[PDB]
Structure formats: structure tokens, C-alpha cells
């Protein structure tokens, strides 16, 4: 029972640590969106970074 409760605590910890990792409201580790596109060229062409949910 003690080992199970330790396991459960650690799982809840993983969840908290994962959902708090936002910068400026946008994040690539929670799983909110599928990809983020940044500017890479003075004409609008983008640099694509896929989302890696953890």
C-alpha cells in the first residue's frame, strides 16, 4: 500500500509538472496545439516546430 501511494503521488506530480510548462500562454509540451510556426524569412515563410506532448 505504501509503494502504491508513492506511485500515485509521483504520477500526480508528473501531471502538475507537465501542465505548468507554458511561456507567454503558449506551450509545446502540454498538448494544446499540433504545431508552432515562427517567422524565418522577411516574406512570411515559416519555421515549423511540431508539438511533442509529454
Amino acid at each position: 500500500n505504501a509503494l502504491k501511494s508513492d506511485f500515485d503521488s509521483l504520477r500526480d506530480q508528473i501531471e502538475k509538472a507537465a501542465t505548468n510548462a507554458k511561456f507567454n500562454g503558449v506551450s509545446i509540451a502540454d498538448g494544446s496545439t499540433t504545431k508552432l510556426t515562427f517567422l524565418a524569412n522577411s516574406d512570411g515563410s515559416g519555421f515549423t516546430v511540431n508539438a511533442k506532448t509529454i
Partner: protein, 53 residues
């Protein structure tokens, strides 16, 4: 860890690069001294008309 990251990000957004302003400042001081000498040169126009009469 998160608070450190947020501070670094805000700084990334709105911080300057002083090395560029130093160069620009030197160039602008030279350019202003030059523009003053140029204005002083241009001012003395029309001063030659007196010699005509």
C-alpha cells in the same frame, strides 16, 4: 525554474544590444558635427552679392 524562464523571456523580448548603439552613436556624433559645418557653409551664400555693387 519557471519564474527564471519568464524573466529571461521578457528580457529577450525587450532588451537592447548596446554594441550597435555605440557604433551608431559615434557615427551620429560625427554626422552632426559634419551637418553643422555643412549648414555653416551653406549659410554664407548670398554674401558675395555685395562685391557686385
Amino acid at each position: 525554474k519557471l519564474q527564471d524562464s519568464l524573466d529571461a523571456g521578457v528580457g529577450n523580448l525587450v532588451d537592447a544590444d548596446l554594441a550597435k548603439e555605440s557604433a551608431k552613436l559615434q557615427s551620429l556624433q560625427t554626422k552632426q558635427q559634419l551637418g553643422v559645418q555643412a549648414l555653416s557653409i551653406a549659410n554664407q551664400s548670398s554674401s558675395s552679392i555685395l562685391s557686385l555693387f
